[PDB]
Write a protein that binds this DNA or RNA. Structure first.
Ligand SMILES: [Mg+2]
Ligand SMILES: [Mg+2]
Ligand SMILES: [Mg+2]
Ligand SMILES: [Mg+2]
Ligand SMILES: [Mg+2]
Ligand SMILES: [Mg+2]
Ligand SMILES: [Mg+2]
Ligand SMILES: [Mg+2]
Ligand SMILES: [Mg+2]
Ligand SMILES: [Mg+2]
Ligand SMILES: [Mg+2]
Ligand SMILES: [Mg+2]
Ligand SMILES: [Mg+2]
Ligand SMILES: [Mg+2]
Ligand SMILES: [Mg+2]
Ligand SMILES: [Mg+2]
Ligand SMILES: [Mg+2]
Ligand SMILES: [Mg+2]
Ligand SMILES: [Mg+2]
Ligand SMILES: [Mg+2]
Ligand SMILES: [Mg+2]
Ligand SMILES: [Mg+2]
Ligand SMILES: [Mg+2]
Ligand SMILES: [Mg+2]
Ligand SMILES: [Mg+2]
Ligand SMILES: [Mg+2]
Ligand SMILES: [Mg+2]
Ligand SMILES: [Mg+2]
Ligand SMILES: [Mg+2]
Ligand SMILES: [Mg+2]
Ligand SMILES: [Mg+2]
Ligand SMILES: [Mg+2]
Ligand SMILES: [Mg+2]
Ligand SMILES: [Mg+2]
Ligand SMILES: [Mg+2]
Ligand SMILES: [Mg+2]
Ligand SMILES: [Mg+2]
Lengths: 394, 199, 153
RNA sequence: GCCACUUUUGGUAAGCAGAACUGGCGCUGCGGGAUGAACCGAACGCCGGGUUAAGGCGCCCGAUGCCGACGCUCAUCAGACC
RNA sequence: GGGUGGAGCCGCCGCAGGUGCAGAUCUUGGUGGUAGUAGCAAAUAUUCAAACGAGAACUUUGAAGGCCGAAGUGGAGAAGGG
RNA sequence: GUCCCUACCUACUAUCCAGCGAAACCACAGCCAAGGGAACGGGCUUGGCGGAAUCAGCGGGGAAAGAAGACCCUGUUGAGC
RNA sequence: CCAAGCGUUGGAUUGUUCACCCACUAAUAGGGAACGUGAGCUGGGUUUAGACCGUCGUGAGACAGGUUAGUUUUACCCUACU
RNA sequence: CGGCCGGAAAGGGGGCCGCCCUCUCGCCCGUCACGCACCGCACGUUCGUGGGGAACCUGGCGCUAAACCAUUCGUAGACGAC
């Protein structure tokens, strides 16, 4: 017979091989389509997830019931140091797809990027690119290099530059940086390679890639949760208490006469650590980093134009399980994918966005930087000791 | 030792029938530019037959199902496999002998392509009937590379046009050479004309 | 006694035999296939690392239900186990064959294990007690180990 | 016991039940009908050569790779062999 | 023919039978795959050092931490065991 | 917390390893759609196709296993009443 | 008409499939997959053995009549899927 | 033998300027004989310095690496894996 009461289907078949993903950092499956009218720009970046925080801002959207009222909103802080460009990759379009043409690296490559080519940096004798880097300081070598830059000018269509993180600035344990091909969308192939090789071997910060108040897409693997049953993975209904062989299951796998079990049946396996791509995350703030001026460091990241405090984006006692965000960062609306200390690929949106919720200007009033290791109730150390007075430690 | 067939103007199964038997006889056949293969009947019936082929699908796990190849070269490869006995070693050896390309790649752009008049749409269709282009059907049904193959074919048509102009002016030099030298090759020419090579 | 294959040179080959060894046949056959080609000192440090769980025995034929380990990727196999008394019985047999090469007057440090063979010994029974008043067998599976070492440079 | 040409009873009908004549299947392979107890051809010692039946001859798959004859037929559900 | 084995065996003419195995959920004996698998999960719990020893998570001694808690995991009987 | 609506913590498992280690079951065995067929195939026909060896689960399918149907009928087979 | 992409509910009564009513709704459409789905569950009903009632039978007992209590066994094999 | 270009869809063993060399030999008709004429007889004639594998080899210009276990981490985790 049929199904007695029709109900919608648990889970989605669009995300169907729910497995541990093969790649740790999330990769970009599609960059935005380039048009030659724009100036050249990187269409992605790469920063690491630090933690979660409030904001307070006044919403100016006409016609809502929250017009000129004052919300709080959950934000995520992605600590985002400037990435170091190391090489450019060209691609020719083929009837079988889009194959790579000629990868050309820089001369000097930082050791934190060199670590990526080694499953064991300890026992290796660190010999990578040593025969290759000699192609820059001899005349026959750089004639060969001008030859294949000229070939990449002639035969390539899309051009994407290798850039790695600068891991020695992060509070993490690891040192082995992350490398990424970021597509240079902008002018022609000539102007594209000109920009790419003149910014070869040097840095590029966040603000040259993203602007403030801009919807981006966040890519990464989720927070892995292990081998888990159908109730905790596929959210099927728990069978009642009286069930003999356990209740946290799916009762009927499939019908008789399709003599298999279909791939659409909700079964127990790996939950979490899946590659995911969420879209339309609004950037509220692109923070300046810690830097030195006139001898003392200037620190006030979490200061707004309505607060003028001296507090930074770091809460009391640092972000829990991450560390202290010192250099540049982006502050995004709501939550993104993955646990703390997680590499988290940012990129541009493929969509054109002419709607006012994507076009809302953002004026922040208060970034609640209290302690996350409990119930924090003080914004900063000076306010805490000025409220509590002298302790016995003094 | 290798047939290079063009694919423009040939009917799908009516070309695959000659190619199947010719490959079972041990030839090596390269059917090139398979986005120019015609199919008889009109375009809407032909894409309805292909969408029916898409709907036919293994229910419990379509990963095991019929792999509907969307590229035109592989649609033609699947129909040659339909005409060959591919479950056995001689049919699989035949499918190893057959190579099929979209567009005309650089191993075979510098060669001369054959045509099969027994499969050719200007012969085996009445001129008022409708036909259907396999490349436009395949793009219509999910092949992604019509535009890049079209631009690459435009490039090779330009470069072959340059080659053809130079071959023309070479053969003009050849006939001016013959008219300059006929007085002293006349005794070599007329012995070919009496044996019917040159009239 | 009567071995399976005689050595191709009896003058520079020592021999060793053991019958009815109370150790499992399936655990012993595959550690014998693990140490089948080795040099003698390499084989002894292999078996002691098997006892200390630093190198595993890839279970290749008697394969079902034994889980995986990471130390078997150096054997090119996903599964492996570390059978310690199965290492120890044929480790005693390596000591016996090394003693026999010493008695015969051979170069000890040139002994490659050429032949090794594990057969099934007669099963010796015990009882187990099942539900509903039944009795099932609880058979042992001892083995016969046979080993031939030969001088090689 | 069962099936089939034709005759025929009951039942709306049945791959249903019940008869008559004859042939089959059972007891029976083989070529054809893709597949198949019964249909078409044909009944069998082991083989070589030739030739056929029924059915076929784009390719699977032997044989139309005839410069086959005369027409009809457009299907956004074509049609294709007791 | 070759190998193994170590004390009896066959051909022909008649005779006589407890005379030929793939099946009987056949009888008896052995052996596989399952399979190094299920499992070795009722009643809170072990740890350090030493001794004997070829060898010690399991024996013994000392110390520590626990339990049975006087209707006991204690001290003795009856039936049964021998 | 029976449920909306499930979530979390603990002990003993299950997991992995050292040692010891069975049984039920088994024609050969195991990928599907349709066709015909003893009128619901793993095998045949026509297609789809097919890549060693394996681990933890799982209960669709093997018209899964046990038990010469107990219901119905036949028996010139019986018994209790 | 093209069209099954996406939905088609919460409850009172009954073991119910059906049925009926309250309420929301956008709509409360119909169905199939061995009348899907018991090594998935439940065991309310039917359908064992105990019992009470009505009718029938002289009686043992019978009831497509009502009522009450009544063991729901195994996966570690192969495939399939995760 | 040196320099110039021509190729990216799966990149052309092509074209060009000279050079010290050497040739009237290469091709077409004729003169001249010679070449195991192996005694009628099969896989002959090639792409063939063919693909793959070993050591014999003689020189020259060049290179002296990672992976896996083990340890650790805990963004991961049944075990592997990450
Ligand atoms: Mg429905
Ligand atoms: Mg129960
Ligand atoms: Mg907190
Ligand atoms: Mg096995
Ligand atoms: Mg198993
Ligand atoms: Mg027991
Ligand atoms: Mg008992
Ligand atoms: Mg009848
Ligand atoms: Mg007969
Ligand atoms: Mg017959
Ligand atoms: Mg038919
Ligand atoms: Mg007939
Ligand atoms: Mg007739
Ligand atoms: Mg004949
Ligand atoms: Mg035919
Ligand atoms: Mg004797
Ligand atoms: Mg007798
Ligand atoms: Mg027998
Ligand atoms: Mg017998
Ligand atoms: Mg176990
Ligand atoms: Mg006592
Ligand atoms: Mg006592
Ligand atoms: Mg298990
Ligand atoms: Mg074990
Ligand atoms: Mg077969
Ligand atoms: Mg089943
Ligand atoms: Mg059963
Ligand atoms: Mg019975
Ligand atoms: Mg019976
Ligand atoms: Mg009778
Ligand atoms: Mg009686
Ligand atoms: Mg209720
Ligand atoms: Mg049912
Ligand atoms: Mg059941
Ligand atoms: Mg079932
Ligand atoms: Mg009941
Ligand atoms: Mg009465």
């Amino acid at each position: 017979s049929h199904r007695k009461f029709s109900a919608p289907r648990h889970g989605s078949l669009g995300f169907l091989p729910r497995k541990r993903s093969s790649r740790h950092r999330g990769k970009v499956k599609s960059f935005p389509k380039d048009d030659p009218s724009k100036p050249v720009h990187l269409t992605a970046f790469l920063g690491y997830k630090a933690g979660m925080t409030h904001i307070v801002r006044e919403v100016d959207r006409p016609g809502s019931k929250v017009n000129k009222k004052e919300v709080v909103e959950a934000v995520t802080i992605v600590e985002t140091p400037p990435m170091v460009v190391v090489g450019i990759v060209g691609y020719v379009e083929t009837p079988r797809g889009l194959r790579t043409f000629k990868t050309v690296f820089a001369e000097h490559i930082s050791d934190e990027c060199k670590r990526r080519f080694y499953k064991n940096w300890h026992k290796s004798k660190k010999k990578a690119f040593t025969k290759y880097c000699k192609k820059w300081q001899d005349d026959a070598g750089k004639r060969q290099l001008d030859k294949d830059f000229s070939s990449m000018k002639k035969y390539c269509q899309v051009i994407r530059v290798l850039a790695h993180t600068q891991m020695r600035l992060l509070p993490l344990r690891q040192k082995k940086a992350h490398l990424m091909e970021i597509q240079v969308n902008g002018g022609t192939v000539a102007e594209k390679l000109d920009w790419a090789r003149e910014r070869l071997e040097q840095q590029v910060p966040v603000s040259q890639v993203f602007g403030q108040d801009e919807m981006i897409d966040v890519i990464g693997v989720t927070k892995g949760k292990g081998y888990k049953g159908v109730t905790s993975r596929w959210h099927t209904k728990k069978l009642p208490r009286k069930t003999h062989r356990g209740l946290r299951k799916v009762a009927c796998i499939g019908a008789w006469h399709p003599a298999r079990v279909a791939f659409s049946v909700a079964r127990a396996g790996q939950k979490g650590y899946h590659h995911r791509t969420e879209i339309n995350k609004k950037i509220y703030k692109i923070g300046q980093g810690y830097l030195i001026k006139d001898g003392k460091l200037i620190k006030n990241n979490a200061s707004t134009d309505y607060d003028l405090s001296d507090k930074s984006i770091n809460p009391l006692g640092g972000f829990v399980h991450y560390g202290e965000v010192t250099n540049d960062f982006v502050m995004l609306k709501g939550c993104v994918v993955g646990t703390k200390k997680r590499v988290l690929t940012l990129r541009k949106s493929l969509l054109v966005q002419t709607k006012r919720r994507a076009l809302e200007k953002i004026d922040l009033k208060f970034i609640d930087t209290t302690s996350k290791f409990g119930h924090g109730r003080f914004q900063t150390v000076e306010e805490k000791k000025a409220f509590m007075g002298p302790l016995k430690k003094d | 030792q290798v047939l290079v067939l063009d694919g423009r103007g040939h009917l799908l199964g009516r070309l695959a029938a000659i190619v199947a038997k010719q490959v079972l006889l041990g030839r090596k056949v390269v059917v090139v530019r398979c986005e120019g293969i015609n199919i008889s009947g009109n375009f809407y019936r032909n894409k309805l037959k292909y969408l029916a082929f898409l709907r036919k699908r293994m229910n419990t796990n379509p990963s095991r199902g019929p792999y509907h190849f969307r590229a035109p070269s592989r649609i033609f490869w699947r129909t040659v496999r339909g005409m060959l006995p591919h479950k056995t070693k001689r049919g699989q050896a035949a499918l190893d002998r057959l190579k099929v390309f979209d567009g005309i790649p650089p191993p075979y752009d510098k060669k001369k392509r054959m045509v099969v008049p027994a499969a050719l749409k200007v012969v085996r269709l009445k001129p008022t009937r409708k036909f259907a282009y396999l490349g436009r059907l395949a793009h219509e049904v999910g092949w992604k590379y019509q535009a890049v193959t079209a631009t690459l074919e435009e490039k090779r048509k330009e470069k072959a046009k340059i080659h053809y102009r130079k071959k023309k002016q070479l053969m003009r030099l050849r006939k001016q050479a013959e008219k300059n030298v006929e007085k002293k090759i006349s005794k070599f020419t007329d012995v070919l004309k009496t044996h019917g090579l040159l009239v | 006694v009567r071995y399976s294959l005689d050595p191709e040179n009896p003058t520079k080959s020592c021999k060793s035999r053991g019958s009815n060894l109370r150790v499992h046949f399936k655990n012993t056959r595959e550690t014998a296939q693990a140490i089948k080609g080795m040099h003698i000192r390499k084989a002894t440090k292999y078996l002691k690392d098997v006892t200390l769980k630093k190198q595993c025995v890839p279970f290749r034929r008697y394969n079902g239900g034994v889980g995986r380990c990471a130390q078997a990727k150096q054997w090119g196999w996903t599964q492996g186990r570390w059978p310690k008394k199965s290492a120890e019985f044929l480790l005693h047999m390596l000591k016996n064959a090394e003693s026999n090469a010493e008695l015969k007057g051979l170069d000890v440090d040139s002994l490659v294990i050429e032949h090794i063979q594990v057969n099934k010994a007669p099963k010796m029974r015990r009882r187990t007690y099942r539900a509903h008043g039944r009795i099932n067998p609880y058979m042992s599976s001892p083995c016969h180990i046979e080993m031939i070492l030969t001088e090689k440079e």
